[PDB]
Amino acid sequence: GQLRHNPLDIQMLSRGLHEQIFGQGGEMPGEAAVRRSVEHLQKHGLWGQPAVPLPDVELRLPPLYGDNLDQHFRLLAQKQSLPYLEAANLLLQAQLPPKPPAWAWAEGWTRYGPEGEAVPVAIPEERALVFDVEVCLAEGTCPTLAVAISPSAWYSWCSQRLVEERYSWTSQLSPADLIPLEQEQLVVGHNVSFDRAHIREQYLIQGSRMRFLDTMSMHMAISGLSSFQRSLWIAAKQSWDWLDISSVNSLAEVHRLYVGGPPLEKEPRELFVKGTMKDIRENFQDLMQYCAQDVWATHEVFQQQLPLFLERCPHPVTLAGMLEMGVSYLPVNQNWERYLAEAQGTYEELQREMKKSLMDLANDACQLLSGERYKEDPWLWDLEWDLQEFKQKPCSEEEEFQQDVMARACLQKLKGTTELLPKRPQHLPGHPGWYRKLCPRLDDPAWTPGPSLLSLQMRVTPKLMALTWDGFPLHYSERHGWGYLVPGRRDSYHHGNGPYNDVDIPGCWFFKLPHKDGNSCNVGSPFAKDFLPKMEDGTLQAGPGGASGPRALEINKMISFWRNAHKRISSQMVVWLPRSALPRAVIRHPDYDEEGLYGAILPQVVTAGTITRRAVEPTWLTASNARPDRVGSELKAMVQAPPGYTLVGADVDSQELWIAAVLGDAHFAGMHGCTAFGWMTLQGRKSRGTDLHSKTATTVGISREHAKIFNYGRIYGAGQPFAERLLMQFNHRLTQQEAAEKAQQMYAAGGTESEMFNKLESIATSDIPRTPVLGCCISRALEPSAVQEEFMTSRVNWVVQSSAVDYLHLMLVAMKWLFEEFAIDGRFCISIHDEVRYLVREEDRYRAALALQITNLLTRCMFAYKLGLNDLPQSVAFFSAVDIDRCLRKEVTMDCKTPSNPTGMERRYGIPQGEALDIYQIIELTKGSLEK
Amino acid sequence: EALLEICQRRHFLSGSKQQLSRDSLLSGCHPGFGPLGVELRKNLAAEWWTSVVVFREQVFPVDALHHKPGPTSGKLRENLLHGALEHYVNCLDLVNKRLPYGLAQIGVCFHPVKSIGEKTEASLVWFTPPRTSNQWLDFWLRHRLQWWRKFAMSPSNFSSSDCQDEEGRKGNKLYYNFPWGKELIETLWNLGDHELLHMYPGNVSKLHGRDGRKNVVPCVLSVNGDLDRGMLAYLYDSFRKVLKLHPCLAPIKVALDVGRGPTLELRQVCQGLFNELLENGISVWPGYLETMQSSLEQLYSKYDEMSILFTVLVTETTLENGLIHLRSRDTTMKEMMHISKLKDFLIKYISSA
Amino acid sequence: EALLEICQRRHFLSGSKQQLSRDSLLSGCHPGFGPLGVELRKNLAAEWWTSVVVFREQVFPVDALHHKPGPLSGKLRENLLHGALEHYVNCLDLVNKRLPYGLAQIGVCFHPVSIGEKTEASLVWFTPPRTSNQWLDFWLRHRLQWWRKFAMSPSNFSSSDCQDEEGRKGNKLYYNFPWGKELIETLWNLGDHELLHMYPGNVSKLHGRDGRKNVVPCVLSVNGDLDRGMLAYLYDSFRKVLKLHPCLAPIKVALDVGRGPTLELRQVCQGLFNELLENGISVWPGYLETMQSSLEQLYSKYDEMSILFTVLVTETTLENGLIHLRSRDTTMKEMMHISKLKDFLIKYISSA
DNA sequence: GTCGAGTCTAGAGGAGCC
DNA sequence: CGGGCTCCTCTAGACTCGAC
Ligand SMILES: Nc1ccn([C@H]2C[C@H](O)[C@@H](COP(=O)(O)OP(=O)(O)OP(=O)(O)O)O2)c(=O)n1
Ligand SMILES: [Ca+2]
C-alpha cells in the first residue's frame, strides 16, 4: 500500500511520491531522538491523539534532473538565469565611450557612435542595457525621453509628443505610444519596474524573454535598512557601526555607499515633476544630460553591487526568482474605467452627504457670536471668535429708455470707485475666526459655497457635533490628544485614562479617551473605526443625537480606504492593446466584445524592497479585498482575464507557522512532529476548520484574521499586554479581567515553542546569518558585527520572512520550469507575499493547477530536505485549494458587492464564479499528467 | 403646523387651513400654489429637465396631449406614458433607429380622487434593448435617487424599494420620509414590449431598433415622478424659523433693500442693481419699493421665512465708497462687499451650489 | 404646403403626412408638436416671460387649475383670466394693497371645435379706472414690439382697434399668413364687472390703494396664442431654409466629425459638446451618426432644422485646433480655434 | 521697510496589504 | 520588544513676497 507513517505516527508522503522525490534509502532517525520526542509529546499530552489518514496520492512526477532535489533546483535555476548572468557580466566588463557633446533632437532611437556621431536606429539591438525613462507628469503618463547605456555605444530616445507640439494628444495610451525595445535581453535600472512600464512590447499578452534587474533591490539584499533604520539613518545624517555600510534607496545615496565618487547632481527646477512640456523643450539638453548622469551612476552601482549580491546570495534560485518576480502582468478591460468612475462618483456622493451635516452645524454655530454666547458653550468656548474690519485705503418709450439708461449709468459710475479698495480681496472679514478657515477662498478654482473645507478628521468637527463621552464633553489637548472634561474640581469619582493635571482647565479634570494601543498613544480623531462600538454602546454620543454620529462613523469607514487610495488607483498606467496586437484566440472567443477595450497594467514592483527581500508595490500589494462597506474595495476584482484566458493561483497554507515548526522539528530531534508546536501545526485541515488559526478563533471569539494577527504577534515577541489589548479590541464582549485570564492561558509555556525560539535565536546571533534553505545572507547593516544586540526582533523575524521569500523564489522557478517543459500556454500574473497567480488559457487551466500542486510538493520537500529531514508529511504536501477564476479575488465564491458595485460582479460585469479545486479533483480532470 | 402657516403666510400655498390639510396636499385637490410655490416648482422642473434631458444625446422632449380622444367620449390623461409611446416610431428617425433613446415630458396628469386631483408629473420613457434593460433600470434608479438627494438637507429621508408588478415585471419606487410617514414620489417600471406591441399591432419591422448591429424590439422603461409632492418634500426638508432651501431651488435669490437718505439717488442705485441682477438671471425681491418701513430684524426674519439667500442693502455710504451690506441666510453674518463684485459673486454662488 | 412638409420631416410637427392640416393646426386639434417644435414653443414662452414678468415688479406668476369644480359637473378651463381673478384678493397682500399689480401665467386652454388645446400666454393687469386706457396702450405697444422683435418681416404683424358688444375698448394683434390674416393676440379693457361678479358684496375687500384713495380696480386682459405665434414665426422664417431668430431657434450648433480616427475626434467632440451644454447652448449630436453623408446633405438638413452654425471636427483639430464653422444665414465657411467657439456663440446670441 | 497672506515641509495619527 | 511595508490628511512652524 501507499500509506506510510513515522515513529511519531504522523502520516508521511505517499510511497509513490517519496520514491520519486527523496529516492530509496536514507539515514534512520535513531532511538534516543524518538524517545525524546515521545517524552515531549507525552508531557504536552499529544502522543495518544489519533488522526484519520488522508487519501493517498499516486502521480508520475516530471523527471528530476540532478541526483537529488537540491541539484535539481540548482540546474533549473542555472538554466533559467544563464543568459541574464552573461548579459550582466557583459555590462560588468563594459567599455563606455564618453557621452556625445550634443544630444540628438529627433523621433525614435538614436545611436551615438564615437566622437558624437548620431545615427538613427529602429531599436538599440543590444543584449544588455542600463535604462532610465523621464516622463512629463503634467502632460500625463506617456514617456518623454530615455537614455540607454550599452557596452558598445550610447542610446537616446525622444517621444513624438516631445518633438511635436499638438493641440491635444490621446489620453488613452497605446503600444504605439511607448518606447520600442526587444535571445534573452537584460535591462538594468534603479527602479527598473517604473522603466519597464514604458516599454512597448511589455504589454502584449504573450510573454517575451526580456528580464529586468534592479539596483535598489540588490541594495536591500546586500546592505539594506529597515524603515526604523532608515529614519535613524536620515536623522543621524542631518551601536551605530551600521551607518558606514548602509544607505537609503536613493540613487545618490546608493552611489555614495558603493562608489563614493563626486556627489550626484539633481535638477533643482524639477521640470518633469513640477514643470511643463515647454520647459522640457527649452531645457532639453540639460534634462537629457541629467538622465545620462543617472544612467552612468546606475551602471557604476550595478558594477559595484553584482559581485556582492552573488557573494551574499550564492544560490541561483534567488536570482532566478528575482528575475521572475520582476515581470508582472495584470490584464484589464473597459470595466476598469467604469470601476474608476463609479468609485469616484460614490465617493463624491458620500463625501457630500458627510459635508452637508457638518456645514449645517457650522452655519448654525455662527449665531453664537451674537451676544457673546460662545463663552458658555462647552464645545466652542475656546475657539477663535474674533472679527476683522473691512480694510480700505405709465411711461413713454423715450421716458422708459431714458430712465433705464440713467439707472445703468449711475450703476456704472459706482462700479468705477475700485481705486479706493485694496487690491488683495479680504477673506470673510465679518465671519468669526474659525469660520474663515473652513471656507475656500474665491480665487480657488474648486470653490464651493459654505464651509466646504470641513471633514471629520479636523479638530473642530468633534466640537461642532458636541461629542460626549459618558456624559462629559470632548476636549482636545495638544500634549495628550483627544480627551474629555469631568466637572467638579472645586479647588475624582470618575476613573479612566487618568486625571492629567497638565491641561489645567478650571473646574474640570482632563481624562484621555482610551486608545486601542495603550495609554502611551493619543487619539487624533474620535471618528476612527475603534469608536464605532462605543458609538453603538452609547458611551460616545453626538450632540444632535439620533443616528448622525453613527452615520458619520459609518460613512468615514466606507470612504476611508478610497480617500487614501484614489490617487494611486486612478493614476494606474493602462495601455490598451489594439486588435492587431491581440492573440487570435482572444479574437475568436465568444466572450470577445468587438466594441470593448482590452489592456494591461504592469505593477511597478521593487523585487527586494524589504530587509527580508519581500516585494513592495504602492498599490497592488496594498489593495484591499472586496467588502460590503468599503468603497472601491473591488480593486483586485477588476483584474479580469482576457476572453479565452483564466487566472490560476493558490495561497500557501500557514506558511510562516509551518516554516517555524519545521525548523524547530529539525533542530529538536530530526523528525517531523518532534516538537509540540510542530505536532500541533501538522494535526489540522483547513477544510475541517481545525488549523491553528481556526483553533485560536474558536478558543477566543475573534475572527480568523484576528487569530492570524494574534498568533503571529505571539510568535515574534508580543507580550501579554499586547495580547490583552488585541483581545479587548477584537472581542468587545470581553472585560479586562477576562482578557487577562485569556492572556495567561494562550501564553502558558520546557515549553511548547522552545526549540523554535532557540533555533531562531541561534540563526540570528550567527556571525553571518543566512537563510536555512537557500543560504541568503542578511543585510550587512544587520549582522551582529554591525548592530550588536540591537534590532533583535527584526533579526529573529528575518529568518522566517526570508525563508518565505525563498519559498516564493522556489515556487516561481518550479512553475516556470513546468510551464516551459510541457508547453502550458500561460505566464506569471502577480505574486503577493504568499500568493502566486498565473494567467493561463482556458484549455490548460487544470494542467496549470496540477503544475501548481507539483510545485508546492517540490517546495515543501526542498524545505524539509535542507533542514536535515528526509521525508514530508502528507498533510502539507499539497495546496488545500487551487483557484481557477476569470478575475482576481480572495475567494472564488464571493461576489464583490460594495458601495461602488452594489449589484455584484455577475450582474454588473458578467463575471461567473470560479472554482476551488483540491489535488484529487485536479488528478481526475487531468488524468494525472501534464501532457496535451 | 408651523411649516404650513409659513407657506400660507409667505405665499407658497393658497387658501386656508381647511383646503391645505395633509390629504388635500397629497391628493391634488388643493387650490393652486402661490407665486413662491410656482417659482420653487419651476426651479425643480428646470433642474429635473437639465439633469435628465440637457446632458443626454438621446433624450428628446415629447408633447403629449392632455386628453385622449375617441374610444365615443374622450378622457383626461392619467399618465404621460401613453402619449410618449405614441411617438416611438416617429422619434426613431431622429436617432436613425439607434437605441437606447428616451422621450421626456413634464405635464399635468388628472387622477380621480368624484373630485379630480391635478398632479404635475415628469416622465421619461426609456427605450432600451432587452439585453441591458436591468442595467439601465438600476442606473436610472441610482441617478434619480442621487438627483433627489443632492437638493436635500437630509438625503437619508429619500429612500428606495424594490417592487414587482402583477405580471412579475421588475421595478423600483422612491419615497420621502415625511413626518407622518413615507410617501411615494417616483416610480420606475421595467415594462417589456407588451405596450409597444399592443399599441402597434401588426409587423414588428417598424418597431425594430438597433442594438449595435442587431435589430430588436425595445423594452420600455418608464420613470414617473411627482413634482408637487417633490416640492412639498423639499419644503418639509428645509424646515430661528428659516426655510433652508437649496440655492438652485429657492424661489427668490436676493432681497434688495435701502437704508436712510438720500432717497432719490439710492432708488436709482437699487433700480440699476435690480436691472443688472435681472438681466443676469437672478430673481430679486424689490424691498426698496415698500413704503411701509420695517425694522431690519423683522425684514431679516421675513426674508428668512421666504428662503431668501442674500439681503443686499444699499445705504448712504454706498454712494461714497461703493460698499453694500450682504447678510447670508446660512450664517446670518453681515459682510461688506463692493457693488461691482455682487453679480459675479451671486452667479458663482448659484452655479457652484 | 412645402413648409408643413419640411416641419413634418424635421420633427417640428408630429403626426403623419396627412394627419396635419392648416385647419387642425390653427384650431389646436393637431396630434401635437415634435421635439423641435416643443423647443421653439419653450423658447417663445421664455421670451414672453422675460418680456412681461421678469422685468417688472408688479407682475407675479399665477397657479390656475385646468378644471373648475362646483356648479356653473366640473369643466375644463377656457380662459386663464378666471384663476387670476380668483387669486386677486390673496395676491393683493403681497404688494401691501398697492396698485397697479399683475398676474401672468402660461398654460393650455381648451376650446370646443372635438377638443382643441391651445397654449395661451395671459396677463391680467389690475389698475384704477383713471389710467386704464393709458396702460392698455402701453401693453399694446409692448406686445406689438415683442411680436415684431423676432420677425424677419415685422410688417406682417399688424394691429387693429375694435369695440366689443358691450362697448369696451380693446385691441387685436394679427399676423399676415400667406392665405390671410389670423388673430394671434387680443387685449381688452374689461373694467370691474367680473371682479364684482366673482366677489359679490363687501367691496371693501376689493379696494386697492391708488396712492391716497382706495379704488376698486379695472382689469386688463392680455391674451396671446403661443402655438399660433409659433406657426407665424415658422411661416415668417421660410434654397430651403428656416431662418428662425437665434433667441427662438431650437437647436443652435450642429457638431459633426469629418474623418478618422474615430476615438480622438469623438473625445474632442464630446468635450466641446459638454462645454457648450454647460454654457447654455443647444447642440445637435450629429457626430454619433454611424455613416456620415455628403456635407451638402448635412448642410441642407441643418438649414431645414433652423440650426445657427455647424461645427465640423477633423484631424486638423487635433493638430491645430481649427474647426470648420458654417453660418446658416450667410452660407459662408470659416476656420476658428476651438477654444474661442463658446465665446463666439455666446456673443452672437447676445448680439441677436 | 513692516507686515499679513501663499508656500513648502516635517511630524503625528490613521489606515490598506502580507 | 510582533514584524515587514505602503500612503494619506491635518496641523504647526519657518520662509517668502507683494502691497501699503
Ligand atoms: N499579521 C500578519 C500577517 C501575515 N504575516 C505573514 C505570515 C504568513 O505566513 C504570511 C502570509 O500571510 P497569510 O495571511 O496568508 O497567513 P497564512 O498563510 O498563515 O494563512 P492562510 O493559511 O489562510 O494562507 O504573512 C504576518 O507575519 N503577520
Ligand atoms: Ca498564506
Residue numbers in the entry:
A (entry chain A): 67 to 248, 262 to 317, 344 to 498, 532 to 629, 731 to 988, 1051 to 1233
B (entry chain B): 67 to 137, 177 to 218, 229 to 354, 369 to 482
C (entry chain C): 67 to 138, 178 to 218, 230 to 354, 369 to 482
Reproduce text from the manuscript describing this model.
Mammalian mitochondrial DNA (mtDNA) is replicated by DNA polymerase γ (POLγ), a heterotrimeric complex consisting of a catalytic POLγA subunit and two accessory POLγB subunits. In addition to its C-terminal DNA polymerase domain, POLγA also contains an N-terminal 3′–5′ exonuclease domain that is crucial for proofreading during mtDNA synthesis. More than 300 mutations in POLG, the gene encoding the catalytic subunit, have been linked to severe, progressive conditions with high rates of morbidity and mortality, for which no treatment exists.
Wild-type POLγ produced full-length, double-stranded products of 7.2 kb in less than 15 min, whereas mutant forms of the enzyme (R232H, A467T, W748S and G848S mutants) only produced a smear of shorter products and did not synthesize the full template.
